[PDB]
Motif scaffolding. Sequence first.
Motif, PDB file in Angstrom:
ATOM      1  N   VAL A 499      -0.283  33.609  -2.953  1.00  0.00           N
ATOM      2  CA  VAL A 499       0.601  32.930  -1.876  1.00  0.00           C
ATOM      3  C   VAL A 499       1.614  32.014  -2.321  1.00  0.00           C
ATOM      4  O   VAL A 499       1.058  31.062  -3.122  1.00  0.00           O
ATOM      5  N   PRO A 500       2.614  32.582  -2.193  1.00  0.00           N
ATOM      6  CA  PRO A 500       3.799  31.253  -2.613  1.00  0.00           C
ATOM      7  C   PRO A 500       3.530  30.118  -1.850  1.00  0.00           C
ATOM      8  O   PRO A 500       3.231  29.867  -0.692  1.00  0.00           O
ATOM      9  N   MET A 501       3.866  28.813  -2.672  1.00  0.00           N
ATOM     10  CA  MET A 501       3.588  27.539  -2.037  1.00  0.00           C
ATOM     11  C   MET A 501       4.381  26.536  -2.726  1.00  0.00           C
ATOM     12  O   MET A 501       4.777  26.667  -4.123  1.00  0.00           O
ATOM     13  N   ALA A 502       4.928  25.508  -2.083  1.00  0.00           N
ATOM     14  CA  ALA A 502       5.544  24.246  -2.677  1.00  0.00           C
ATOM     15  C   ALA A 502       4.328  23.616  -3.522  1.00  0.00           C
ATOM     16  O   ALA A 502       3.212  23.427  -3.047  1.00  0.00           O
ATOM     17  N   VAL A 503       4.758  23.193  -4.760  1.00  0.00           N
ATOM     18  CA  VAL A 503       3.971  22.372  -5.495  1.00  0.00           C
ATOM     19  C   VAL A 503       3.539  21.072  -4.729  1.00  0.00           C
ATOM     20  O   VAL A 503       4.536  20.327  -4.511  1.00  0.00           O
ATOM     21  N   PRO A 504       2.292  20.619  -4.527  1.00  0.00           N
ATOM     22  CA  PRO A 504       2.056  19.664  -3.905  1.00  0.00           C
ATOM     23  C   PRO A 504       2.717  18.231  -4.238  1.00  0.00           C
ATOM     24  O   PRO A 504       3.082  17.236  -3.703  1.00  0.00           O
ATOM     25  N   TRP A 505       2.509  17.941  -5.779  1.00  0.00           N
ATOM     26  CA  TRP A 505       3.107  16.982  -6.360  1.00  0.00           C
ATOM     27  C   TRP A 505       4.580  17.078  -6.870  1.00  0.00           C
ATOM     28  O   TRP A 505       5.130  16.118  -7.527  1.00  0.00           O
ATOM     29  N   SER A 506       5.142  18.220  -6.251  1.00  0.00           N
ATOM     30  CA  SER A 506       6.807  18.329  -6.904  1.00  0.00           C
ATOM     31  C   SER A 506       7.159  19.494  -5.878  1.00  0.00           C
ATOM     32  O   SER A 506       7.568  20.417  -6.421  1.00  0.00           O
ATOM     33  N   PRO A 507       7.378  19.125  -4.522  1.00  0.00           N
ATOM     34  CA  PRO A 507       7.782  20.124  -3.693  1.00  0.00           C
ATOM     35  C   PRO A 507       9.049  20.896  -3.909  1.00  0.00           C
ATOM     36  O   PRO A 507       9.431  21.983  -3.323  1.00  0.00           O
ATOM     37  N   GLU A 508       9.880  20.377  -4.588  1.00  0.00           N
ATOM     38  CA  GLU A 508      10.998  21.227  -5.424  1.00  0.00           C
ATOM     39  C   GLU A 508      10.902  22.247  -6.311  1.00  0.00           C
ATOM     40  O   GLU A 508      11.848  23.066  -6.407  1.00  0.00           O
TER      41      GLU A 508
END
Lengths: 715, 723
Positions: A499-508
Motif C-alpha cells: 500500500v503506497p504511503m507518505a513516510v510518517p517522518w518525511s511526507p515528501e
Amino acid sequence: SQLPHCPQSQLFADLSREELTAVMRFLTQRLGPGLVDAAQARPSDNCVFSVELQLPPKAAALAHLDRGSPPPAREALAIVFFGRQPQPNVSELVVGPLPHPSYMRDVTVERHGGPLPYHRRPVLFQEYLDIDQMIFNRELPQASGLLHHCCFYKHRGRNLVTMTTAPRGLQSGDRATWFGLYYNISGAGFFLHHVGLELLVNHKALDPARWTIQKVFYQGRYYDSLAQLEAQFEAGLVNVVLIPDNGTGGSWSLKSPVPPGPAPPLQFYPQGPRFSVQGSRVASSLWTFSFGLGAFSGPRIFDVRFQGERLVYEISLQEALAIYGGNSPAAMTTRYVDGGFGMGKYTTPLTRGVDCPYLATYVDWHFLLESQAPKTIRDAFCVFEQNQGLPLRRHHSDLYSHYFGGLAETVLVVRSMSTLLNYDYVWDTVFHPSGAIEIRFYATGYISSAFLFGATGKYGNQVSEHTLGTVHTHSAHFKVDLDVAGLENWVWAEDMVFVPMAVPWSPEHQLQRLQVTRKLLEMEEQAAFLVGSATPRYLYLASNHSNKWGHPRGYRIQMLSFAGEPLPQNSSMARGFSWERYQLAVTQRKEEEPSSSSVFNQNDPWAPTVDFSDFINNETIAGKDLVAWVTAGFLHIPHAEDIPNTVTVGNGVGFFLRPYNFFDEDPSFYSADSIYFRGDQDAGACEVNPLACLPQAAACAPDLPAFSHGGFSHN
Amino acid sequence: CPSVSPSAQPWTHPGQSQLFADLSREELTAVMRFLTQRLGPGLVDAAQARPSDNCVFSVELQLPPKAAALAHLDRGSPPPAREALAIVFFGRQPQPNVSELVVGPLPHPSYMRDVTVERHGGPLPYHRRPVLFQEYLDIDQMIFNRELPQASGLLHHCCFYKHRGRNLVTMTTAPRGLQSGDRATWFGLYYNISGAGFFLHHVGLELLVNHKALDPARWTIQKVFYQGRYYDSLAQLEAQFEAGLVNVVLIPDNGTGGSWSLKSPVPPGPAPPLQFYPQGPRFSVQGSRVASSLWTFSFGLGAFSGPRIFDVRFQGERLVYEISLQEALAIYGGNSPAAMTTRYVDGGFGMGKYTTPLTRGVDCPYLATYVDWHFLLESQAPKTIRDAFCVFEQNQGLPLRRHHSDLYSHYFGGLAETVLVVRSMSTLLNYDYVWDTVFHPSGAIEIRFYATGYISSAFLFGATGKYGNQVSEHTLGTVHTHSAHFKVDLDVAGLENWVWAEDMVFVPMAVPWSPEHQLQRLQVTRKLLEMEEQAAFLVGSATPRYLYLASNHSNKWGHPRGYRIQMLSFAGEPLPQNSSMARGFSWERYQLAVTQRKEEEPSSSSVFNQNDPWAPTVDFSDFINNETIAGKDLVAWVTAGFLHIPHAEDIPNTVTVGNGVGFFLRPYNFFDEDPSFYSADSIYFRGDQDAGACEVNPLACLPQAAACAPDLPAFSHGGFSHN
Ligand SMILES: *[C@@H]1O[C@H](CO)[C@@H](O[C@@H]2O[C@H](CO)[C@@H](O[C@H]3O[C@H](CO[C@H]4O[C@H](CO)[C@@H](O)[C@H](O)[C@@H]4O)[C@@H](O)[C@H](O[C@H]4O[C@H](CO)[C@@H](O)[C@H](O)[C@@H]4O)[C@@H]3O)[C@H](O)[C@H]2NC(C)=O)[C@H](O)[C@H]1NC(C)=O
Ligand SMILES: *[C@@H]1O[C@H](CO)[C@@H](O[C@@H]2O[C@H](CO)[C@@H](O[C@H]3O[C@H](CO[C@H]4O[C@H](CO[C@H]5O[C@H](CO)[C@@H](O)[C@H](O)[C@@H]5O)[C@@H](O)[C@H](O)[C@@H]4O)[C@@H](O)[C@H](O)[C@@H]3O)[C@H](O)[C@H]2NC(C)=O)[C@H](O)[C@H]1NC(C)=O
Ligand SMILES: *[C@@H]1O[C@H](CO[C@@H]2O[C@@H](C)[C@@H](O)[C@@H](O)[C@@H]2O)[C@@H](O[C@@H]2O[C@H](CO)[C@@H](O[C@H]3O[C@H](CO[C@H]4O[C@H](CO)[C@@H](O)[C@H](O)[C@@H]4O)[C@@H](O)[C@H](O)[C@@H]3O)[C@H](O)[C@H]2NC(C)=O)[C@H](O)[C@H]1NC(C)=O
Ligand SMILES: *[C@@H]1O[C@H](CO[C@@H]2O[C@@H](C)[C@@H](O)[C@@H](O)[C@@H]2O)[C@@H](O[C@@H]2O[C@H](CO)[C@@H](O[C@H]3O[C@H](CO[C@H]4O[C@H](CO)[C@@H](O)[C@H](O)[C@@H]4O)[C@@H](O)[C@H](O)[C@@H]3O)[C@H](O)[C@H]2NC(C)=O)[C@H](O)[C@H]1NC(C)=O
Ligand SMILES: *[C@@H]1O[C@H](CO)[C@@H](O[C@@H]2O[C@H](CO)[C@@H](O[C@H]3O[C@H](CO[C@H]4O[C@H](CO)[C@@H](O)[C@H](O)[C@@H]4O)[C@@H](O)[C@H](O)[C@@H]3O)[C@H](O)[C@H]2NC(C)=O)[C@H](O)[C@H]1NC(C)=O
Ligand SMILES: *[C@@H]1O[C@H](CO)[C@@H](O)[C@H](O[C@@H]2O[C@H](CO)[C@@H](O)[C@H](O)[C@H]2NC(C)=O)[C@H]1NC(C)=O
Ligand SMILES: *[C@@H]1O[C@H](CO)[C@@H](O[C@@H]2O[C@H](CO)[C@@H](O)[C@H](O)[C@H]2NC(C)=O)[C@H](O)[C@H]1NC(C)=O
Ligand SMILES: *[C@@H]1O[C@H](CO[C@@H]2O[C@@H](C)[C@@H](O)[C@@H](O)[C@@H]2O)[C@@H](O)[C@H](O)[C@H]1NC(C)=O
Ligand SMILES: *[C@@H]1O[C@H](CO)[C@@H](O)[C@H](O)[C@H]1NC(C)=O
Ligand SMILES: *[C@@H]1O[C@H](CO)[C@@H](O)[C@H](O)[C@H]1NC(C)=O
Ligand SMILES: [Ca+2]
Ligand SMILES: [Ca+2]
Ligand SMILES: [Ca+2]
Ligand SMILES: [Ca+2]
Ligand SMILES: [Cu+2]
Ligand SMILES: [Cu+2]
C-alpha cells in the motif's frame, strides 16, 4: 575391550485373515450356492469380487475413542458380481458383527440411488485370460504370415503379451478395450517393446464366444480385421519395420554391468528404536496413529495424535489418474482411473534396503480379492525413523552473547508402494518433530511406450530404437479430514499486499507499506480452487478457540504440486474424475460423502458412480466438521533418462500440513534431542552436550537381520 | 573398522586443478603486505577505522575469465593469472570514495589495478560504504553515553536501566535513509538476553541515527519512536513522561520458555538415528576439489555473494561452469518504523562474511567432512571460520528407481537413492540461512536454501494483525518475505546453448474409428525462445512446465541434449516498481531469466546496493535487453522465495520443515539413457533366483559387511568470536 552389539484401540485396523475367512464363510452360506471362485468366474457367474473393512461412522468412532462409549459395530464390505441373472445388479453388501458375523445388508440402492450396471464391473483376472485365449488362439494366427515376418511368431503364441488400456469404450455401457502387443521380455520391462499392433476387443457379451474384434491398428494404419491386414501384407503393400526382440542396455535390462563398490551409507538406532508398531497402531514419543490400506483407495491413516492431541481423523489416498496422449489408439485414448484396479490390491512387497532403509520395520498386508481364501502381501508397509541430515532449527550467535541452540531433524515415515502395470507409485506419509505432517507420492518404474512412426514430437520423445515415450499426466487426490482442536472448524485465507504511503517522518517521500490480507471463506464455493487459479499463499483450517496469544488455533495446507492441465469439461469422460479440475477444496464432511471416486468409475466414467464436483454444493463451511480434498500432480514428457526406470528425483509431489498458531510455541523447544550450549561452556563436555557422548553410545556394531524378500507368486 | 579413506579415493583421468579455490592464509597475507607497502602509509586497521580513515575493507579471490579458465581446464593452456580483489575505503581525502582494486599474480603479487571506473563507469560514492564494525561501536557510544541518559527517568521506570552499564542492545536496520546519499539508520533497542535470542525482546524504542557525517561528533538523532508514538528527541519524550502523559507498558526483564531460552527442559532420551560408511567413505575432499565416483567440482564462498560451485562434471563431463549464490533479500512490514521500512540486501553485509561454524551432528550428519574457511575482512590479519563447510553422503531412505514385476515375468529392479551434499550456513543477525547443493545419482543437481533461526520482533501495540501475529507477551512477529537469487551458468554439452519451452494442450477431434464421437487429443507444445526478453519470466506470470537449455547436438535418439530448470518456489509479491528503492534488487521481480553470459556481467547484485539502492551500483534488469539467446554462452538467473507470516510455532526458532525453497537441474535427453542403470549399487534379481544369495543380491551381504562399530571422532565445535 570386545565391542558389543547394539539393541489405544484397533478400530481402524484392516481385516485379519480370520475376519476375512469369517465373512467369506458367512457369504458362501447365506448367499446361496451357485457361487464361483472369482479367479475362475466367467461373466455369467455369481462372484465375490472383494471383501475388505467397512469404515465405521465418525460420531460412534469418536464417542468410543474420546467419550469412552462402546465401539461401533466392526463391519466389512463385499463387492458381489451377480451374473447368473437376466438383469445383473452388481451389489455392495455390508456384513455382520465381524468377530462372529451375523447379518447382511445390501447398500447399493442406499448409496448410489439405484442398481449398479453390470458393465461397470472391473475386468476380472479370468476375463483377461479369456481375452488372451481369443487373441492368441482365435485371432492372431489369422495374421501369422505377417507375424512370422516381423515378430518371431512361434506356432505356440507366447512370445507376445498383451497390456490392457483404459476407459473401455466411448460411451456409458461400452466394454471395448484396446490391447497393445509387446514382446514377452524375460526379467525386464516389456513396456518398452511394443511390436506395433493394437487390437480393439469388444468383451461386453456375457458369453465370451460372442466377443469380437472391432478394429486393428498396425504400425501406423487401421484395419478392419486381422485377415484384412494379412491380405494387404501378402499382397505386398504393408511394409514392415522389424522390431528386434533382444539386445543389451537399459532398453533391455535392469541388471547393471558394473559390480558393487564400497557399501553406501546405512542408518541404525544406536540405543534401540524409538517407536513401536502394535498391529495397526504406531506409537512414538510424539506421534500416535492407525494405518492401513483400502483395497482400491490405497494407503490411509487414522486417529493421528501429536503429543496426545488429535490433529486429523483421516488422511487417505482417494484416487490416482494417468491421462495419455499419443500417435496410436492405445496411448491417445488411455485414461487410467487406477482405483478401478486398486492401489491396495496392487501393493507390492518392499525390497529391504532399496524401497526403505534396511533397518526399517516391515509389515504384512492381508487381503481377500478375486479369490475365496485370503492372501498376504509380505512387507507391504515399512515404518522407520530417518535422520534427515538437516537441522530442524538452528541459531549460532556471535552477537552480544555467544551461544548455539539447534536440533537435527529426524522424521517418522510410513510407506506403501503400488505397482499398477508399468509404473510404481510410492506413498509417503512423513511425520515431522515440529508437529507438521507431509504427504508425498512418487512415480517411478517403467514408462508406457508405443511403436514410433511418422510424428514430429506432438506426442512425446523418442527414447530408444523404434520406441515413442508417450506423453501423459499424473495426478492424485487425497482426503484430509482435519479436526483442528475439535470438530467445528473454519477456513482462513491470508496473503499479502503493498500500500503506497507518505513516510510518517518525511511526507515528501513515498514508501510501499507491506500488509497482510485476511479473509474468512464462508461458503464451500469460496474454498474450491480450480487448477490454474491464483491461490492464497496462506490457507488454513482453524478452531474457534485461541492459543495463548489470542489467535485461532489452526493448521495450514501448503502444496508442492506441478499440476498438469486438466481434461476439458467438454469431454463426457471428465465427470468420472472431476476432482482433477481442482487443486484444493474444503467441503462439509458427511457420512454419505466418504470418497471422491469409485472403483466403478474406471469402466464407466461417462455415467460416473461417484462425481466429486457434486460435493461442492453451496453450503456453509463456517463452523462445521470440515474435510479438505487436495489434488497433486504433474506433467511427464518421457525422455532418454527414463529408460531404466523413472527416477524419483524432483518428481515428488504433495502437500504439507503445518501448525499455524495451533500451539503457544514450537514443541521442538521441549525436544529431548535439542542441543544447546553457551560459548563459555564446554561443548565437548558430555554433561553439557549430549553429542559429545555419542561416540561412547554409538561404539557398537548393529545387529541388522538377514535379508528376506517378500516374494510375489504369479497374481 | 576403517578410520580414514579406503581404496584410494577416485581413479579417473586428469584435469583437477584448484583455479577456483578461495585464497589461502598465505595468499591473503601476501596481498595485505603488498597493499600496506604500495598503497602508502596512513593506513588504518579496518576494525579500528573511522569514517575519515583510509581502509582495506576486504580482500578475496578475483574469479578468472571463463575463456582463459576453460582453455586451461580443457585445451591444456597455462592457467590465467590468479588474482584478488580488494575493497578500499579512501576516507583521508577531500573527495572520499570506495575503490575496487585487483592485485598481483597471486603466488607472489606484483601489480595493482583500480577497476572501479572500468566496472561501474565512475567513482563509488563514499556513502555507499558498508557500515563498519567500528562505526556500529561509535553509534553505540553515542546512544549509550550521549543520548540514552537523557531519558533515564523513563528508562528506570520501564526497562531496568542499571546505572550506566549496558543491559540493552541495539540492532541495525536496512536502507539507511529515504534517498540516494542518506545514511540515517533506525536502531531498535532490546534487552540484552544472556544465552538466547534478544530479537524477541523489543523494549518499544527505536532511534533514527544520522551517521552520514565523517566526524562522529556531528552525528545526530533525527527522530525517536517509543511504544506507538513519535518524538523529536529523547528530551522531548522524557519531558512528556515526567509530565505524566506518556503511559508505559512494562516489558518484563526475564522469563522462562522458548520466548526466553533454547535449552530444553527435557533430558536426553535414546539416541536418534545415525549414518556411517561401513566400507569407508566413497568421496574425497582435496582442498577445494571434491571428487567421487560420479561427481567432480570445486567449491567455495564469496565474502558477500556467498556459496558457489565451479567446474561440475558428471562422470567426467562438465554440466555447469558456475552455480553461485548472488543475493539474499528480506522485505519487512510492521507497525513500527524499523519493521515497516526494513529491506535487507544481505549481500551488503556478506553471506560468506557471516558464515557460522557447522555443529557436528545438528547442522550436518556427525560423520560429515567438515572444512574450514579462511578470510580477510575488516582486519589486517586473516582469520578462520572452523567447520564452515560440510560435505557428506546421505542415504535418502527412498528409492531412486524401482520396479516390482508380478506380470508375465517375475523380477525386481531398483536402487536406493544416496546423494552428495555440500552445505554452508550464514547467520545474518536474527536468522540463519542454510545453503544446500545436493548432487543426485541420476545426473540431477539440486539447490535448496533454508531459513531458520530467530524471527525479528517488535513491541506490540494497537494493531489488528495487518502486520503480523502476536507470538509472545508484548511481541509482534513482523511479516516479511525471503527471496534469494542464483547465477546458474550451464554449459550443456558445450558453450553454445539454446532455450526451449515445452508444455501441453488438448485438441478436440473426431474419434478416428467412430467419428460420431469427440475426444480431447493430448499434445505437446514446443517453442524456441529466441530473444532474451522471451526468457525473462516475471513473478506471477504463467511458466512453461518444461523449460530447459539444450545443446546444438543430439543424443542417440536425435533430440537436443539439454538440461531443464524445475523450480520449487512459493515466491512472494515483489516490491512495486513505483518505489525508487526497487532498482537495487530488480532481480526479485523475476522467477527465472536467461541472458547472454558476459564477463562484464558477473553478478546480479553488489555489496554497495544495501546502503544506496536508489542509485544502484548493479541493477539486474539492465542485463535483459534485445539480444539473442539462440546459440550463445547462456546463463540462467533463478529467483526463489516465499512469504513468512510469523506464528506461535516460531518462538524457539523457525523450523526448516516445508520452508525449503529452490530449484532442480535435471537431464532432459542429455544422455542416451539414465546413467543409474550403470550404478555399482543397483539391485536386481529374478523370482526364480535366490534373493538371499549374496552372489545374486549384494544386500544379502550387508549384514556381513556392516558388522562393525563405527570410529566416530570426538566431538569438536568451531568456537565463536566477539564480532
Ligand atoms: C514369457 O516368457 C518367459 C520365458 O521367456 C516365460 O517365463 C516362464 O514362465 C513359466 C511359467 O510361470 C515359469 O515356470 C517354470 O518354472 C517354474 C519355477 O518353479 C520353481 O519356482 C516356483 C515358484 O514360482 C515353485 O513354486 C516351484 O515349486 C519351483 O521351485 C515352475 O513352477 C514351472 O512349472 C512346471 O511344473 C508344473 C508342476 O509340475 C507344471 O504344471 C508346469 O507345466 C511346468 O512343467 C515351470 O517349470 C518359468 O520359470 C519361466 N521361465 C523363465 C526363464 O523365467 C513366461 O511363461 C512367458 N509368458 C507367460 C505369459 O508366462
Ligand atoms: C439385486 O440382486 C440381488 C441378488 O442378485 C437381490 O437380492 C435378492 O433379493 C430378492 C428380493 O429383492 C430375494 O428374493 C426373494 O427371496 C427372499 C428369501 O431368500 C432369502 O432368505 C432365505 C431364507 O428363507 C428360507 O428359504 C430358503 C430357500 O430360499 C432356505 O434356504 C432357508 O433355510 C429359509 O428356510 C435365504 O436362504 C436366501 O439365501 C435369501 O437370503 C425374500 O426374503 C425376498 O423378500 C424375496 O421374496 C433374494 O433372496 C435375494 N438374493 C439373495 C439374498 O441372494 C437384490 O434384491 C437385488 N436388488 C435390486 C434393487 O434389484
Ligand atoms: C466456539 O464454538 C463452539 C462450538 O459451537 C460452534 O461454534 C459456534 C461459534 C457456532 O458457530 C455454533 O453454531 C457451532 O456449533 C461454541 O460452543 C458453545 O458455547 C456456548 C457458550 O460457551 C455453550 O453454551 C453455554 O450457554 C448455554 C446457554 O444458552 C445461551 O443461548 C440461548 C439462546 O440460544 C440464550 O437464550 C441463553 O440465555 C444462553 O445465553 C448454557 O446452557 C451452557 O451451559 C453454556 O454455558 C454451548 O454449549 C457450546 N456448544 C456446545 C455444542 O456445547 C463456543 O461458544 C464458541 N466460542 C466463541 C464463539 O467464542
Ligand atoms: C552446432 O552449432 C555449432 C556452433 O555454432 C553455432 O551454431 C551454428 C548452428 C550456427 O548458428 C553458428 O552461428 C553458431 O555460432 C556449429 O559449429 C560450427 O560448425 C562449423 C561446421 O563444422 C564450423 O565451420 C567449418 O566450416 C568452415 C567453412 O565455412 C563454410 O561456410 C562459408 C559460408 O559462411 C562458406 O563460404 C565456406 O566455403 C564453408 O562452406 C571451415 O573454415 C571451418 O574450419 C570448419 O571446418 C564452425 O567453425 C563452427 N563454429 C565455430 C564458432 O567454430 C555446428 O556446425 C552446429 N552443428 C550442427 C548444426 O549439427
Ligand atoms: C549482554 O549480556 C551478556 C551476558 O548477560 C554479556 O556477555 C558477557 O560478555 C563478556 C565480555 O565479552 C564475556 O566475557 C567475560 O566472561 C569471561 C568468561 O568467564 C570466565 O569465568 C568462567 C567461570 O565463571 C570460566 O569458566 C571461563 O572460562 C572464563 O574464564 C571472562 O573470561 C572475561 O574476562 C569476561 O569477564 C562473558 O563471558 C559474557 N557473559 C555471558 C554470560 O555470556 C554481554 O557482554 C552483554 N552485551 C554487551 C554489549 O555488553
Ligand atoms: C469447450 O467448450 C467451450 C464452451 O464454451 C467451447 O467454447 C470450446 O469450443 C471451441 O474451442 C475453439 C478453440 O479450441 C474455439 O475456436 C471455438 O470458438 C470454441 N467454440 C465456441 C462455440 O466458441 C470447447 N473447447 C474444447 C477444447 O473442447
Ligand atoms: C539375448 O541375446 C543375448 C546376446 O545378445 C543372448 O546371449 C546368448 O546366450 C546364448 C545362450 O545363453 C549363447 O549361446 C549366445 O552365444 C549368446 N550370444 C551372445 C552374443 O552373447 C541371450 O541369451 C538372449 N536372451 C535370451 C533370453 O535368450
Ligand atoms: C529469571 O528468573 C528466574 C526466576 O525468578 C523469577 O523472576 C523474578 C522477577 C521474581 O518474579 C521471582 O519471584 C521469580 O521466581 C530465575 O530462575 C532465573 O535465574 C532468572 N534469569 C536470569 C537471572 O537470567
Ligand atoms: C504504480 O503507479 C501507477 C500509476 O500510473 C498505478 O496505476 C499503479 O497501480 C501503481 N502500482 C502499485 C503497486 O501501487
Ligand atoms: C527492442 O527493444 C525495444 C525497447 O528498447 C522493444 O520495444 C522492442 O520490442 C525490442 N525488439 C525486439 C525485436 O526485441
Ligand atoms: Ca458438501
Ligand atoms: Ca473436520
Ligand atoms: Ca544480456
Ligand atoms: Ca553457458
Ligand atoms: Cu509418468
Ligand atoms: Cu522468515
